[PDB]
Each structure stands twice: as C-alpha cells, then as structure tokens.
C-alpha cells in the first residue's frame, strides 16, 4: 500500500533505490540457506536479461505483423488479385502488364483506359481513403485515447520519472498497433517507424508486469523502457547501434551505464526477429533498405551546404508553423470535431494526392524511388533523357513541374496532419521532403552544368560522355538534413542513416549537411520539434540546456510566499486521528513535513498524503508519532538543502538523483518546499 | 589565487561548475558588442574540438614514433643490416638466407653455425638485454619517477577528480615515451599498447595548458582526459569504437554524455594519424592486425567453456599472486634496490627466454604466430604434420613439450615483472598467455580426434581428408578469455577485439569464453587487477559496486567523535588578523565552517584553509566577516545534508555531483564534516 504514485506525477528515485536495497538485503538473507533459494535468486538475476529478451522478441513480432498488414492494406487502395486474394499487387506481379492483378474500373466498368476509368479509380481512391481514415479514427477514439500523437514526447517524459498509467497499458498495445496499421494504410503524411517505439515500449511494460521486481520498482521499469526505446527505434530503422544511441540521445533521461548492454541486446534481438520474419518471401529488413556504389567529388561539396540551408531553414519554418497550428487547432471550435477534422484532412490528401504521380504512391516507395538513380532498365518520366554532358529532352521540364508541385504539396499537407487524433510520425515526412529537395537540386545542377559546361569551373571536373553528378546522394543528404533540421538530431541520426544505408563513402556529405542544418535551425529556436511538442503539452520536462541569468537563490522560490497562506505541517503528541481526518479533508496537498510543535517550526521528518491516509484508516479499522504509536511508518530522514542555496545546485541535485521535492530550512527551522512543478513554473 | 587545489587531493566539481557559470556570464556580457568579441567567442567554442583534435594528432604521432623505435631497437637485439644500417632485419630481408643481415657471431667469430656461434649470440643477447633494462631503469629513476607501473590506475583516479601535478607534466611525456620504447626493446613481459594511453593523456594535458578555458577548469580538463583515454586505447589497439567504449567502462568516472562525440572524434583522429604514418613502408595499422575467413562448428562449443575455466582460473590465480608479491616486494629490503631488481628480472628473462624458441621472439610476434594457422608455405616445427584425420609426425610431441614450457615460463615470469620501476602493461602478457593456452588445447583436441575418430561424437562432424578444427580461433578465444579474466572486461574488451580482428563470425565464442572467465573470476575476488592495484596504492576511488550491510547513518561518521578533539571553526567579529594567523599556524586541517559564535554552533558559512590563508596575507599586505570587511570573499552557501541521513544517500550525492566534503548539522547546529577520505576509511 505504501509507495504508490498517483497518475500524472513524477517519481522520486532515491526512495525506489532504498526499496531495491532492502529487497536485496532480504534476498541475501535467505540466499545461501537452501538450493531452492539459490534457484530463485538466479531466476531473479536473469530476469534482467529476460525482460529485454521478451521485449525485443515481442517488438519484432509486432513490427512484422504491422508491416505486413500495412503494406497489404495500402495495396488494397489500388486493386485486387483475383487469382490470389491474400497476396498484394507486387506479389502477383512478380508471381510469374499483370492480368491477374485487376483494378476496380475494369472490375465494374470493364474499361482499363480513358476518362471514365480514370474518374472511377479516382473516386474510389478518395472513398477508400475516407473509409480507412474514418474507421481508424473511430477505433482510436472509442477504444484508446492515448494512441494520439507520435509517442516520442510521452516516452521522453515517462523515462524521466513521469507516470501515465494508461499510456502504456495492456489495452493500448492492440489498439495502437491496429490504428497505426490502418492510418499508414490511408497514406496520410505519417509513418509507422517512429511511433512503433511506443509499441515496443508497451511490450516491456506488459511483460514487466509478470516479474514483481521490475513492477513495484519504478526505476527498474524506467530502465526497461529505456532499453525498449532503443529496441523499437532499431526495429523501425533497422539500426541497432543507431537504436541504442537514440535512447541515450533523445529518449532516455537517466542512464547508469550498467544497462547499455541491455539496450544493445534489445536492439539486436528486435532487429534479428524483424529480419527473420518474412512469411511472404520478402528479403529486405525494411521496405527501403538500399545500398550504393556511386562516387562523389570534392567540388561537389559546395551544393550540399546550399541544400543544407534548406535542410535547416525548412526545419525552422516547420517548427514555427505546425507548433503554431497545433496550438490554434486546440483552442478554436475545430478542436471539438476530431473525426470530422481528420476526415476532412484525409479527403484533402487523397483528392490532391492521386493526380500527382509521386504523391499517389506510398511515401516509403517515393523515398525509395528518389534514393535510387535511374536504373539501366528504368524508363520512367523521372529520367527524361534522350556532347560532354548527356542530352536532356523537353519532358524534363514537365518532370520538374510535377516534382516541384509534389514538393509544394508534401511541405504543406504534412504541417496540418501531425496534430490529428491518429497514429503518426515525423520521420517519413521529413525524409520524403528532404529527398525530394535533393532530387530537385541534383537535376537542377545537372542541367546547369549541361548548359554552361564551357566554364573553367566545370570543364576540369565533369568528364565527357559520362554522368558527372549523382542525384541519389543528393536525395540521401537532403533527407538526412531535413530530418536533422526538424528534430535537431546530429549524431544518432547519422548512425541510423549509416546502418539503414550501408557505405561509408557518403558519411562526409551527410555530416556536413546535418551540421549545417542544425546550425541554421538553432538560430530559429534551439528546441527540437519533440521538445516544443512536450512544451505545448506542458509536461514536466527538466531541461538540461537552460541557463540562469539572475544570480538568484531558492530564497526567491521556496514556498509559501508573503502572498500565499502557510504550509500545512503535522505534530506528534497533541494531535489525534480525528484532527488528521479533518486536516486531510480540509487540505488538497501531497507532502507534509512533520515538526515537534507549531512554535518551533523545526524540521524533524517528512511524509506524504497517501501514506498518511492509508495508514490512518488502516489503524482506525484495526496518537504519538515521536519516540498506539505510529512512529515506525513515519519517515524520519528526508533530504534537505540550505535555504540560501543557489537555484542551479538545487536543479542539478534534482536532475542527478531524481527527487520529486526537497525541503528548505533556516537554522533548522523549516521554511518551505520546492517541487519539480514549481521549478518549471519559475522556468517560464 | 582562490580555487587552487593542493597536489594529492580530490576536486570539488560543483564549485568548478559555478566558476564555469560565472565565466559564461562574463563572456555573454560582451558577446554582441563588436565583431572581435564574436570571433573570440567562436574561438572559445571551437576550443572544445581543437583540444581533442590536437590531442589525437599528437597521440598518433607519438604512437608511430614509439612503434618504429621499438621495432628498430628490439630488432637490433638480434643483429645488424650492414648494407643499410637504418633499416631493420625484416625490411632488409624483404628488400630484395639474408646475407645483408648479419649477426654477432659472424661479425666477430665469422662462423654462423656451431656451438661457438650459438654461445656468442646467446651471451650477446643477454648482454644487450641487460643494457636496455639498465638504461631504461636509470633514465626513469633519474628523470621521471611517475613513469612506473602501467598507468591505468592513476588515470582512473585522475578522471574521478584526483590531482597529481607531476603525473602528466610537460616532462613526463618525453621520458615516458623513451623509457617505454627502451623497455619493450628489452623484450620483458610487458607491452607498449596499454601504457600508451598515459602518453596520449599527457598530450591532452599539455595542450590543455595553451587554452585558459580548459586549464583553470578542472572538470573540463577531466573531460579532455577522458577523451584522450579513448584516443590512446584506440591507438594502442586500433579500435576507435573500442576506445570510446573503454573510456566509459574502465577509465572515466563522470560522463555527461555531451562529450561522447569528443571521445569518438579523438579516437578517429588518433587512428587516422596512426594508420597514415608509416614512413618505412608499413601497411598494417598495428603489428598484429589480422583477418580471418575460417569457419567453426557448433559441436566445437564444449571446449571453449573448458578453456574459459582456465581463462577464468588463471585470472583468479594471477590477481591473487602478483597483488601478493607486489605487496611483499614493497615491504622487504628488495624494495630499496629498484635498478638492481630490474636488472635481475631482465637477466632472468633473457637467460630463460632465448633457449625456448617462442620466448626468444618478441611477444607481439609470438601472439601473431599463435593467431595465424599454418599457412600453405608454412614449414615451421609448430606445424609438424606429414585416413579421415590428417597424419601427425613425431615432431608434434616435441612442439608440445617446448610450447608447454613456454606457457609455464610466461605464466611464471609475468607475475614478477608488473611491479617494476619501468613502463609495463598487462594487455600483452595476458593476450600471449591466453593465446598459448588456446593453441595448446587446439592441438590436444586435434590429436584426440585423430586417435579416437571412431567414436560417434566425431564421425558425424569431422570430415575425411580435411582439417576439422581451427586452432587459430582457439588462440583468439584463449587470449580474449584470459584478458577478460584478469582485467575483468566483458564488453569493451570484446568490441576492441572485434575491431582489432575483423569478422563477425567469431563473436559467439568470444562472448561465451569472456562471460565464462568473468563468472569464474568473480568467485575469487570481484575486483579487477587494475582495481586491485588502485586499492594497493590506496588512492581515493569511490567504488560504485559496494553494498552497506548495516543500516548506518551519517551520525556514525560525522566528525569529531567522542574520542577526538573538537573541530576547528571560525568567528566573524571578535576575530582579527593575529588570532586567525595563530589559529592557522596551530592547525593542520583543510576545511573550516564559519559560525556566528562559539555558543550557538549554528552553521552559517564555509571556507578552505588555503583560500583563507591567502586572503589573510593579502589583506595584511594591503575584522568583521558578517554583513575593513572580508564578508565578500567568504563563501556563504555551502552544501549541507541532514545529520540523520543514511550514508548511502551521502555517498550517492558525492559520486553524482562530485563534492570533496559535506557538512552535517543538527537542528541547524553544525556537528561535523565528512570527506571522501573518511568515507573510504569506513569502507574498509
Ligand atoms: N499556498 C501555499 N503555502 C505553502 N506551501 C505551498 C502553497 N502552495 C504550494 N505549496 C507547496 O508546493 C507544493 C506543491 O507543488 P507541486 O509539485 O505543484 O505539487 P506536489 O507538491 O503535490 O508535487 C506543496 O507540496 C506545498 O508544500
Ligand atoms: N579530531 C577531529 N575533530 C574534528 N574534526 C575532524 C577531526 N579529524 C578530522 N576531522 C574532519 O575531517 C576532515 C579531514 O578529512 P580528510 O578528507 O582526511 O582530509 P581533508 O578534509 O583535508 O580532505 C577535516 O576537514 C575535519 O573537518
């Protein structure tokens, strides 16, 4: 009964460490007496490996299920394969102009060409997009309201020591997976990679319920969740080392460095499970695992920086627009119509997604097609090529028009969608926009060299009769730069990109563009998109990048103030159960120091509301607190700090040890108490 | 003047953080006034990259110089290349039974064969080994007494916040490098890999002196040293990721995770400098960089565990013998004759090193020859081979005799040498002993399979007419297991091994053997050899693996005790210059709290002996301390803790924040002070 934390609060880690210490002492007491005790102790010890192992296995299985369901469903938007209903379009196309894969215009109208078939397929596409969007939103609203958003803000807040009982419950796993599948099915500008971490996290949570050790102790569950975060990111990107570094960089809040092997094993197990699972015959770990064998030139360095500016500048734009819109939509009438709003957004997407050739295709496949340079058998309009430079046809102008319109779409439509009550991620929109910009700049530079190759800056670099530029690397660097400039990741992103796409020959432009994008972005708000999303949520995140301009002390922050009523404390002997009931009913606080008497106001001990309550009605069902006596249940060694302390040290202590609140006393006379929420309130 | 730390003490990190904050405020006050201050600020910001870059570059250059010099010296121990004096035997032999590479017997006697030449070469080998040993010990004794030991324990203590002014001085770099070269030249059971980190560290230190930001600041220099540790380990082993993972695990004490990129870049820079530098034409990054393309069988798993036991047991044995001997040699007359002791040890080495074929050769080359399996052109006695199993000749028995004698010599002599007043390391002896044991077990299993292949346990796995076992992998796993079992490294060691020896097909047995050896070793002392030396030196290391059995409080450790005189404190108004001077001269303490008056004994402020003294003579050259007045110089916000605090929380705060000492007060009445040394003393 003691030690339970109310939902929507912050954990106190040192008490949890003391609980673990007493549990360890109890285990050691009976450890060596019998072989059965030894077996139990070894099982408890191996539980540390077991939680990570089961979490990784479940994360891999869930990722496989989600991937197969998602690609299957998003394939249904186009047509069906009569011969094999269970397969998708590409399985039937390769399972041998694919007659066995029919569309709906031919299915009903019987015509595969002409305005009529085009209109029929268009109207169907809108209809099916609406159906998936509506059903996903209805399911999430009815069955799980915490599937919203991406899942990085909430997880970051959870690991720091926050509590959200339902955000990782047994129920949210099923609903989250189903609605993520059905949301990525609709083709909305939202991914199934990043948010999958949440799913991974859930695994840990659920399995942590089976072992008592990691359930009662909050810090142990937090460590398991920090491991599951790396496992989930590794599954999402197939970057186990990137996944481990991700938890340290932008997810985990506390790291004793003794669980790094746990995170590494989690990322290995989850990746292994994901790659092993391929029932339909798929070979790639992820849909868009690509490899390169193309070179790049030193003179080619100048344009990345230019692109880097975009990869950064867009960041500043995005984090300045969506955050604004995400605010406005939460205050105007529009926030009271979730289902209708998401229907409208998805309808706008589909209506302005099918006509454009690129957007009609799932965003992962668009990213792939932008990654790969024109293949020997490639004959798409993206490579409208018919002299030192290769000739270009008139169709390149049309391709540029179509692709620039696709960019102008993907940049706008993504801003409005991340604040919807359905699963969504930002990795995919960022990657896609960056890759699109990269391809644009690559084509532009190729044409510019073609027209004016006679200049000295070009004749000595570009070879005659051969390609001089590699737009695939431009797409890669653009994607990485935009992702870095939106979510302000520099090293974890580079590691994940390296693991996703093998080949060390491209690390230099990637690092250059990422650093340039970060530099540009920091000038327009040094907080990542996830940081500012937590800010909008108002969650209690204790930033490790703030600076105190004023040389102020806790004297200005210790509560109460001259304009606030006095704090509530407790006495030992003169006070009985009835007074305790009256005080508890007549006050709405959480923690109470205990003092000898009112006149002295000298700090003696500390206690919390819920222990005091449960204890008093337990005693009533079945008074002096100093040396019936209730001294034992009263904690007597609370952490203190000198009242004249500078605030910076107090903040550092809270961040390092993880104490929800600390007292503040003068000459031994208790004065005030400071909690994380108060520190954040003064942080404004 | 204020803030300087006396040698052989521990740093207080929070005051250093406050100094960093005030410096940051001072720099910010004038950041935007003109472009010149902007340039200065950017230079200060880039200083963080600059220190690591210069440290890595210098470490690489020094490692290259040391490697070439060590090869050249240890090569002259055998003979000389008359045609080209500067070259070594290997280059001269490859520069075309090598007539241009002459030996001593031919040079003087003129005959390359017969007992006479054997005796001449043997005696000259002993003489030259004595010459190198004597010169090395004389140089280290005369010019640098801190080059002793390996250098890992001292570095571990330095990063934690210890101070040793001379252990990294401008002078110790030259002497340390020279004597390490001349010591590895003698061929003693000691390597130039591990200790090179010390050299790397020095670089950092020295170059840190050029930037005021990183010089006056202790914690910043500690971060630079933690980076240089990874850089040095990377240079020694050619494992940049290995070095970065090593710094966190067994070297660094504090890591804010914001310098991990610094350590990673230091490792890359150092590795690049090392590989680039090869003036004599060498291509390998290290002497013994190897690659493998050999398979292994699952049924082959059983003996690794057996070998693991050895790799474990030897660990326990070694850490139980040397630590004992290193104690005895420091308390008996033998400790007053350093030069003669090292002469005796080197003489024993050389005299009992040449007759055995393996020990005659430098230990790195022995490790290489044990790593590589018999090549197609190999015809050495190690491969005495002339039916399902390959026939074995009589020479295998003689090879086994010689190699077991070599193992006995290496296990025996290595114990006595690590406590000598010359540069030495444990990586090389551990690797060599483990590899030797691995090769022994490999040959034994091959012979067993040859003799008793008829059993069902072999016919199902070992093919006819081809080799069934790979002793090279056995040597690799033995080396890794012994190193893990002596130095108690599990993950950093395995990553370093992977980087040193490419190929992921050999991670499973490495992990198995390392884990088994660690399990076996922990049963015989859970402290690594490096930890055991840090203990024996008595340095103030605050272990993060101890457990308090008694439910004791700081009330048990607050000083003074009933049996000790009272603490020295200071008044503010009634005191003057004469009284404070007399009190300072009459006491030998380090910290002094300041109180209103003797009767009250209420904590008010705190100060230090050295700061107080410097302030006193400064004031006298050119009294009230409360609100001439010396209030300002008196610190007024010292960290405190409640007297009834459990000791565990106090230890945790010291380990986390890094405070030398904390006061302890009751009811606001100051009672005592607890410092790291006192906590360690009660840790006994
Ligand atoms: N009017 C007040 N008078 C005295 N103390 C106050 C007053 N208001 C708030 N406090 C102190 O601030 C704390 C509330 O901070 P907060 O973190 O928001 O909630 P909690 O303390 O439940 O975590 C209380 O525990 C209390 O000690
Ligand atoms: N006899 C004593 N009476 C009161 N205090 C003592 C006594 N001996 C030691 N102390 C306390 O212990 C501290 C010495 O601890 P130690 O860490 O070994 O040295 P330092 O304080 O110089 O680091 C002193 O600063 C002092 O406050």
From Swiss-Prot, chains A, B:
<dbReference type="GO" id="GO:0030672">
    <property type="term" value="C:synaptic vesicle membrane"/>
</dbReference>
<dbReference type="GO" id="GO:0005770">
    <property type="term" value="C:late endosome"/>
</dbReference>
<keyword id="KW-0812">Transmembrane</keyword>
<keyword id="KW-0067">ATP-binding</keyword>
<feature type="transmembrane region" description="Helical">
    <location>
        <begin position="425"/>
        <end position="444"/>
    </location>
</feature>
<protein>
    <recommendedName>
        <fullName>H(+)/Cl(-) exchange transporter 3</fullName>
    </recommendedName>
</protein>
<dbReference type="InterPro" id="IPR014743">
    <property type="entry name" value="Cl-channel_core"/>
</dbReference>
<dbReference type="GO" id="GO:0045494">
    <property type="term" value="P:photoreceptor cell maintenance"/>
</dbReference>
<dbReference type="Pfam" id="PF00571">
    <property type="entry name" value="CBS"/>
</dbReference>
<feature type="short sequence motif" description="Selectivity filter part_1">
    <location>
        <begin position="149"/>
        <end position="153"/>
    </location>
</feature>
<feature type="intramembrane region" description="Note=Loop between two helices">
    <location>
        <begin position="502"/>
        <end position="505"/>
    </location>
</feature>
<feature type="binding site">
    <location>
        <position position="530"/>
    </location>
    <ligand>
        <name>chloride</name>
    </ligand>
</feature>
<keyword id="KW-0325">Glycoprotein</keyword>
<feature type="binding site">
    <location>
        <position position="427"/>
    </location>
    <ligand>
        <name>chloride</name>
    </ligand>
</feature>
<keyword id="KW-0547">Nucleotide-binding</keyword>
<dbReference type="InterPro" id="IPR002245">
    <property type="entry name" value="ClC3"/>
</dbReference>
<feature type="transmembrane region" description="Helical">
    <location>
        <begin position="400"/>
        <end position="420"/>
    </location>
</feature>
<keyword id="KW-0472">Membrane</keyword>
<dbReference type="GO" id="GO:0005247">
    <property type="term" value="F:voltage-gated chloride channel activity"/>
</dbReference>
<keyword id="KW-0813">Transport</keyword>
<feature type="short sequence motif" description="Selectivity filter part_3">
    <location>
        <begin position="425"/>
        <end position="429"/>
    </location>
</feature>
<dbReference type="GO" id="GO:0005768">
    <property type="term" value="C:endosome"/>
</dbReference>
<dbReference type="GO" id="GO:0009897">
    <property type="term" value="C:external side of plasma membrane"/>
</dbReference>
<dbReference type="GO" id="GO:0035249">
    <property type="term" value="P:synaptic transmission, glutamatergic"/>
</dbReference>
<feature type="intramembrane region" description="Helical">
    <location>
        <begin position="224"/>
        <end position="236"/>
    </location>
</feature>
<dbReference type="GO" id="GO:0043679">
    <property type="term" value="C:axon terminus"/>
</dbReference>
<keyword id="KW-0968">Cytoplasmic vesicle</keyword>
<dbReference type="GO" id="GO:0010008">
    <property type="term" value="C:endosome membrane"/>
</dbReference>
<dbReference type="GO" id="GO:0005794">
    <property type="term" value="C:Golgi apparatus"/>
</dbReference>
<feature type="domain" description="CBS 1">
    <location>
        <begin position="558"/>
        <end position="622"/>
    </location>
</feature>
<dbReference type="GO" id="GO:0072320">
    <property type="term" value="F:volume-sensitive chloride channel activity"/>
</dbReference>
<feature type="transmembrane region" description="Helical">
    <location>
        <begin position="334"/>
        <end position="354"/>
    </location>
</feature>
<dbReference type="GO" id="GO:0008344">
    <property type="term" value="P:adult locomotory behavior"/>
</dbReference>
<dbReference type="InterPro" id="IPR046342">
    <property type="entry name" value="CBS_dom_sf"/>
</dbReference>
<keyword id="KW-1003">Cell membrane</keyword>
<dbReference type="GO" id="GO:0055037">
    <property type="term" value="C:recycling endosome"/>
</dbReference>
<dbReference type="GO" id="GO:0008021">
    <property type="term" value="C:synaptic vesicle"/>
</dbReference>
<dbReference type="GO" id="GO:0098978">
    <property type="term" value="C:glutamatergic synapse"/>
</dbReference>
<feature type="site" description="Mediates proton transfer from the outer aqueous phase to the interior of the protein; involved in linking H(+) and Cl(-) transport">
    <location>
        <position position="193"/>
    </location>
</feature>
<dbReference type="InterPro" id="IPR000644">
    <property type="entry name" value="CBS_dom"/>
</dbReference>
<dbReference type="GO" id="GO:0005765">
    <property type="term" value="C:lysosomal membrane"/>
</dbReference>
<feature type="transmembrane region" description="Helical">
    <location>
        <begin position="169"/>
        <end position="187"/>
    </location>
</feature>
């Amino acid at each position: 009964g003691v030690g339970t934390y109310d939902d929507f609060h912050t954990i106190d880690w040192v008490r949890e460490k003391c609980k673990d210490r007493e549990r360890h002492r109890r285990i050691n007491s009976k450890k060596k007496e019998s072989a059965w005790e030894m077996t139990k102790s070894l099982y408890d010890a191996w539980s540390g490996w077991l939680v990570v192992t089961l979490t990784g296995l479940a994360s891999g299985a869930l990722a496989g299920l989600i991937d197969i369901a998602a690609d299957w469903m998003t394939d249904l938007k186009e047509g069906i394969c009569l011969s094999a209903l269970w397969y998708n379009h590409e399985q039937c196309c390769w399972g041998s102009k694919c007659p066995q894969w029919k569309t709906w215009a031919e299915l009903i109208i019987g015509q595969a060409e002409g305005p009529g078939s085009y209109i029929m397929n268009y109207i169907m596409y809108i209809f099916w997009a609406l159906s998936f969007a509506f059903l996903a939103v209805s399911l999430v609203k009815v069955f799980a309201p915490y599937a919203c958003g991406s899942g990085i803000p909430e997880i970051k807040t959870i690991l720091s020591g926050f509590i959200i009982r339902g955000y990782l419950g047994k129920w949210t796993l099923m609903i989250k997976t189903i609605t993520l599948v059905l949301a990525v099915a609709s083709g909305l500008s939202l991914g199934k990679e990043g948010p999958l971490v949440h799913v991974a996290c859930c695994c840990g949570n659920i399995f942590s319920y089976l072992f008592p050790k990691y359930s009662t102790n909050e810090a142990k569950k937090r460590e398991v969740l920090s491991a599951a975060s790396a496992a989930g990111v590794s599954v999402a990107f197939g970057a186990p080392i990137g996944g481990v570094l991700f938890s340290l960089e932008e997810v985990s809040y506390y790291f004793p460095l003794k669980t790094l092997w746990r995170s590494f094993f989690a990322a290995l197990v989850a990746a292994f499970v994901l790659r092993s699972i391929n029932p339909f015959g798929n070979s790639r770990l992820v849909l868009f695992y690509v490899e390169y064998h193309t070179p790049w030139y030193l003179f080619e360095l100048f344009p990345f920086i230019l692109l880097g500016v975009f990869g950064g500048l867009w960041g500043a734009f995005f984090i300045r627009a969506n955050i604004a819109w995400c605010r406005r939509r939460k205050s105007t009438k529009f926030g009271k119509y979730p289902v209708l709003e998401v229907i409208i957004v998805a309808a706008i997407t589909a209506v302005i997604a099918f006509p454009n050739p690129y957007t009609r295709l799932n965003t992962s496949e668009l990213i792939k097609e932008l990654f790969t340079d024109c293949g020997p058998l490639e004959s798409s309009s993206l490579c409208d090529y018919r002299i030192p430079d290769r000739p270009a046809g008139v169709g390149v102008y049309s391709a540029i028009w179509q692709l620039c319109l696709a960019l102008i779409f993907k940049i706008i439509m993504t801003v409005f969608t991340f604040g919807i009550k359905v699963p969504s991620g930002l990795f995919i929109p960022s990657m896609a926009i960056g890759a699109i910009a990269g391809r644009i700049v690559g084509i532009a530079v190729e044409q510019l060299a073609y027209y004016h190759h006679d200049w000295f800056i070009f004749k000595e670099w570009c070879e005659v009769g051969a390609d001089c530029i590699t737009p695939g690397l431009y797409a890669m660097v653009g994607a990485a730069a935009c992702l870095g400039g939106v979510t302000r990741m520099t090293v974890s992103l580079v590691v994940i990109v390296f693991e996703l796409t093998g080949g060390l020959e491209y690390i230099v432009p990637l690092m250059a563009a990422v650093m340039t994008s970060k530099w540009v972005g920091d000038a327009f708000g040094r907080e990542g998109i996830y940081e500012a999303h937590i800010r909008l949520n108002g969650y209690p995140f204790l930033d490790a990048k703030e600076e105190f301009t004023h040389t102020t002390l806790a004297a200005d922050v210790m509560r109460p103030r001259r304009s606030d009523p006095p704090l509530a404390v407790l006495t030992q002997d003169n006070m009985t159960v009835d007074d305790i009931e009256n005080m508890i009913n007549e006050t709405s606080y959480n923690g109470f120091p205990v003092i000898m008497s009112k006149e002295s106001q000298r700090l003696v001990g500390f206690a919390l509301r819920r222990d005091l309550t449960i204890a008093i009605e337990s005693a009533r069902k079945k008074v002096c607190f100093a040396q019936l006596k209730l001294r034992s249940i009263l904690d007597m060694s609370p952490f203190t700090v000198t009242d004249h302390t500078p605030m910076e040290i107090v903040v550092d202590i809270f961040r390092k040890l993880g104490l929800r609140q600390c007292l503040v006393t003068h000459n031994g006379r208790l004065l005030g108490i400071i909690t994380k929420k108060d520190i954040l309130r003064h942080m404004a």
